[PDB]
């Protein structure tokens, strides 16, 4: 039906019908509801003759916003199955409820992202759901920052048993060449989400997230006595895109307040 | 000489007590056999159960099941509405009724995980916040972590987990099966023998002692075969443990103490059988090749004697009874006995539908893989015939059948059932109740009576786990079986109704029949058309109704209904306290609202219908009695709101500061007040005016207004009050509040001249 | 669902067998 | 994200 439509340059018609087959209760998979939206959006946010700007535009956000989430879910459930240390009871219970029907953000959250300690998608999450809670949100990025660190030690701690002879854990895949260091790490999560949100949110307020990262450098030796430069912090957040202004505005404020780690010498 | 409230009074009394009269298990499942059954396609209006919605497992969790390099398991934690799985040393919990649930990670533990749970915790030891202990036993340890699940608005519990130092190594027994007591007790087994083992835990630590201790029950030795466990069961009700071993040998221990735990009854599928071959219906559902797959506690609330269900791989459910040798020393049995069977349905489920001995021969049941039974019988049956596809049978009691039955010789396990399809690849794990355990009354005597219930608490729901979602299964009342019903015959005849409706009264009788009639026309099961179907119910109510007649006169099955449904929307208030004396009231206050809907409801339908219902205008004895009966529960149902609402105020106010100001006589009538007498008997109207006459005094001294609190009690419990009396109330309110005024000089003679006016 | 509802009162643990 | 497990000093009394 849909196909027909479009050939008839009647792209709004195809939308309709494509996001409601996306919010149904027939039994299609979670991918399939992905395409569905993927192709209502894109069929709402072209003109439609006989139809309104402002029809067609409550559609095509109505198809990005159940798209944006359906993308999470997708994410979870992925991430869920694949996870080793998940017993593969829960995850064919895990798959019964993802694999279905768009979910909303509060269970996403709740049921599953944040039972699994996935912060990087409880950080998208809250993008998603316009959620304002400035200290949840800094909560999470420090569990974030702080769970990355300890994985990269771990791995470089395996490649360092490897080149010295040792035997690894039980099931552990080796690493054939060095991982990168914990800073490199934390921050290629922070790119990471900030492509998929766009520093246009409420997940990246510069005023506590850059305080919260030099903190991290320096409470965790990331500095020159590693090999690493010690501005990174700065230029991972330049390069990200913020404003030189509102850079300095907010090394001021570190400068003056002498807060935390950034006292003394 | 005994006025209308007085006379209904009498009738709501007369009517607890039948519906607190219907059969017990023991007695329709005296020793002998049964395979009665009335069948039912699982589309049909009449099913006993239904599917309401599923719940898919999250994809994050297929991730990490699919990651799984050595096991995986899944679970459920139904009490809360949350699911869990295990991938190797790893662990996830989710809520499964929200719809994108963010998954709780708990990876602290080195080793496989075997089994998880989720009990009650040790009294006096934690925080009161602390709802919940999550029990976590691995290959090497078990390990106890603090639950908090505290509910939210959305209606699903909010899960944070706390740490507590507290956890034992295993040593060189499985750990499979883990199942806790009302008391927090914490009990153990698994897949290497047959030892029972316990947890202990205490707040404090000791130089002598450890947080956490582990200890075996079964202190073994000796020569032992191979045996091993296939689940354990609890009864708090009695105080016992049942573990089922994978020779169906069936253990009873019994805890003689907080610590305690002894092997009482030990009883073999040998002891099995020959109990089997004395009964006069012997079977080849049942021999040495047999197995038991499942066992299932009776409580004693529930039945005295049979204490336990025991399902076959065949589909037979055994149910065994338990006697102690004495009456003196909780007393431990110390014999089981096999006493009534329960033979399978011969039905199979079928996609078009198919069109008195006892049957002790069906395959249908044949093989049952998992088996679930729950108060007041629900039993769910996997089937697993084919190895990809279970099927699921699903039956109750037959309630309707069991009440009507008379004489009580004649009664026997009569059962509604239905098959449930699942789709191909769903793999039944697990089964349980989300709701509240059902319970009609306190004793075996009226305990499973499911109508009397029908509008105080909600259908029993049942969380069904597969290896792709949870299936969310509820029981369906009479109420809403007649609504569906009727909502087909919105389109046929007038005839069409009376077909329905004579099925109904075949079954349940007539006066269960109208009440339902008269329940659907008050809008009960519409909070699942809707207007015709509450309009057919009122034709039927008036048509099928029937009339008053001469034998001392017997009075229309109409009333009879009306008096049936009004006494279940109060059996919960009307023998009760009003107040718990620090004075609470007895009900909650959320629970007095409802009820008081109800009654109202069903006021607004009588008065609506006054013309068309007969016996409500007035009219030759006959009809004469059935005017003055339903008169009489009218002025019950006014009296019922009045006092409700009084109560309302009551506790709107303080009473704790009202009954401190009161004397001696006055305290103990309110200490032993009924709703029953506030409604129906002079004293709780005369103590009532009491209670009236002292709110406003101290509502005066508080201040707040005086004519809004007199506008409160004129109105809605007018009759009551008197309007006498709130003048009065007017005039010892300016008298305190020219007392309030005192010092001033002009204020008061306009006070002190108004309240002598 | 794009509604969240955090509600950490009664879940089910993710780290254990189910009943 | 693994779940905060608050302390025991909150869990168990007095």
């Given at each position: 039906l849909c196909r027909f439509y479009t050939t008839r340059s009647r792209f709004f018609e195809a939308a309709q019908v494509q996001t409601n087959l996306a919010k149904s209760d027939l039994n299609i998979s979670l991918k399939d509801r992905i395409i569905l939206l993927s192709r209502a959006k894109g069929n709402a946010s072209v003109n439609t003759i006989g139809i309104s700007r402002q029809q067609q535009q409550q559609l095509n956000h109505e198809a990005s916003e159940l798209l944006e989430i359906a993308h999470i879910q997708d994410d979870l459930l992925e991430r869920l199955v694949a996870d080793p240390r998940i017993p593969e009871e829960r995850k064919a219970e895990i798959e019964e409820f993802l694999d279905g029907p768009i979910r909303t953000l509060t269970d996403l959250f709740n049921d599953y992202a944040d039972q699994a300690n996935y912060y990087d998608l409880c950080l998208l999450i809250f993008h998603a759901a316009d959620f304002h809670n400035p200290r949840t949100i800094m909560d999470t990025w420090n569990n974030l920052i702080n769970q990355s660190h300890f994985e990269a030690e771990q791995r470089r701690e395996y490649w360092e048993i490897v080149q010295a002879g040792g035997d690894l854990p039980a099931g552990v895949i080796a690493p054939i060449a060095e991982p990168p260091l914990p800073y490199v790490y934390v921050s290629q999560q922070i790119q990471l989400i900030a492509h998929r949100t766009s520093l246009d949110s409420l997940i990246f307020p510069v005023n506590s997230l850059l305080p919260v990262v030099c903190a991290y450098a320096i409470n965790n030796g990331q500095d020159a006595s590693i090999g690493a430069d010690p501005c990174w912090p700065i230029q991972l957040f330049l390069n990200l895109g913020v404003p030189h202004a509102l850079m300095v505005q907010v090394l001021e404020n570190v400068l003056d307040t002498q807060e935390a780690p950034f006292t003394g010498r | 000489d005994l006025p209308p409230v007085a006379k209904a009074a009498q009738v709501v009394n007369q009517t607890l007590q039948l519906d607190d009269s219907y059969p017990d298990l023991d007695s329709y499942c005296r020793p002998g056999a049964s395979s009665d059954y009335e069948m039912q396609s699982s589309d049909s209006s009449w099913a006993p159960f239904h599917v309401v919605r599923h719940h898919n497992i999250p994809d994050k969790v297929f991730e990490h099941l699919n990651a799984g390099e050595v096991f995986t398991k899944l679970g459920l934690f139904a009490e809360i509405g949350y699911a869990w799985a295990s991938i190797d040393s790893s662990l996830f919990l989710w809520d499964y009724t929200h719809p994108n649930p963010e998954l709780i990670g708990y990876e602290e533990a080195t080793h496989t995980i075997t089994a998880v749970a989720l009990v009650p915790p040790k009294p006096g030891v934690f925080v009161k916040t602390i709802t919940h202990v999550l029990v976590v036993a691995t290959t090497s340890e078990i390990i106890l972590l603090g639950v908090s699940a505290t509910p939210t608005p959305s209606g699903s519990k909010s899960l944070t987990l706390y740490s507590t130092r507290m956890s034992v190594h295993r040593g060189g027994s499985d750990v499979s099966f883990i199942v806790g007591t009302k008391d927090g007790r914490i009990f153990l087994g698994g897949e290497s023998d047959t030892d029972i083992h316990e947890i202990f835990y205490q707040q404090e630590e000791r130089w002598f002692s450890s947080r956490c201790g582990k200890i075996n029950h079964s202190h073994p030795f000796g020569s032992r075969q191979q045996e091993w466990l296939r689940g354990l069961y609890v009864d708090d009700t009695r105080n016992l443990l049942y573990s089922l071993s994978n020779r169906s040998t069936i253990r009873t221990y019994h805890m003689e103490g907080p610590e305690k735990l002894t092997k009482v009854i030990e009883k073999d599928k040998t002891s099995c059988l020959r109990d089997f071959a004395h009964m006069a219906d012997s079977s080849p559902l049942f021999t040495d090749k047999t197995n038991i797959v499942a066992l299932s506690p009776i409580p004693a609330t529930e039945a005295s004697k049979l204490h336990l269900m025991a399902l076959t791989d065949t589909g037979c459910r055994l149910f065994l009874s338990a006697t102690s040798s004495a009456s003196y020393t909780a007393l431990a049995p110390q014999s089981m006995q096999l006493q009534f069977v329960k033979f399978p349905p011969r039905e199979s489920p079928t996609r078009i539908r198919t069109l008195s001995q006892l049957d002790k021969t069906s395959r249908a049941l044949d093989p049952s893989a998992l088996g679930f039974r729950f108060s007041p019988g629900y039993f769910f049956d996997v089937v697993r015939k084919h190895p990809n596809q279970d099927m699921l049978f699903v039956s109750a009691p037959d309630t309707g059948r069991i009440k009507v039955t008379q004489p009580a010789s004649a009664l026997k396990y009569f059962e509604q059932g239905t098959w449930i399809e699942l789709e191909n690849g769903n793999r039944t794990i697990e089964i349980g109740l989300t709701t509240a355990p059902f319970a009609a009354?306190?004793?075996?005597?009226?305990?499973?009576?499911?109508l009397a219930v029908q509008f105080d608490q909600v259908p029993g729901e049942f969380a069904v786990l597969t290896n792709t979602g949870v299936h969310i299964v509820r029981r369906r009342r009479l109420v809403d079986i007649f609504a569906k019903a009727l909502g087909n015959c919105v389109s046929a005849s007038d005839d069409a109704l009376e077909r329905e409706v004579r099925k109904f009264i075949n079954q349940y009788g007539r006066v269960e029949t109208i009440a339902a009639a008269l329940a659907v026309a008050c809008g009960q099961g519409s909070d699942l058309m809707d207007r015709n179907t509450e309009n057919l119910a009122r034709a039927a109510f008036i048509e099928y109704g029937g009339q008053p007649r001469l034998a001392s006169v017997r009075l229309s099955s109409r009333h009879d209904a009306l008096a049936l449904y009004l006494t279940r929307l109060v059996r919960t208030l009307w023998?009760?306290?009003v107040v718990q004396v620090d004075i609470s009231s007895t009900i909650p206050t959320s629970k007095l609202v409802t009820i008081q809907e109800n009654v109202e409801r069903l006021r607004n339908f009588l008065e609506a219908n006054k013309s068309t219902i007969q016996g409500l205008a007035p009219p030759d004895i006959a009809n004469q009695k059935e005017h003055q009966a339903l008169h009489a529960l009218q002025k019950l149902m006014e009296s019922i709101s009045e006092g409700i609402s009084f109560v309302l105020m009551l506790f709107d106010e303080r009473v704790s500061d009202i009954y401190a100001r009161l004397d001696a006589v006055s305290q103990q009538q309110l200490k032993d007040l009924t709703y029953e007498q506030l409604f129906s008997q002079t004293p709780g109207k005369e103590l009532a005016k009491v209670l009236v006459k002292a709110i406003v005094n101290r509502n005066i001294a508080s201040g707040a207004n005086v004519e809004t609190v007199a506008d409160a009690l004129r109105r809605r419990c007018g009759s009551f009050c008197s309007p006498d009396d709130v003048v009065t109330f007017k005039a010892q309110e300016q008298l305190q509040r020219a007392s309030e005024q005192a010092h001033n000089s002009p204020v008061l003679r306009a006070l002190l001249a108004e309240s002598l006016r | 669902h794009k509604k969240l509802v955090i509600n950490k009162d009664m879940r089910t643990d993710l780290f254990s067998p189910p009943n | 994200r693994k779940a905060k497990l608050l302390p025991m000093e909150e869990a168990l009394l007095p």
């Open positions: - | 009354a306190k004793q075996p005597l009226g305990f499973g009576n499911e023998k009760a306290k | - | -």
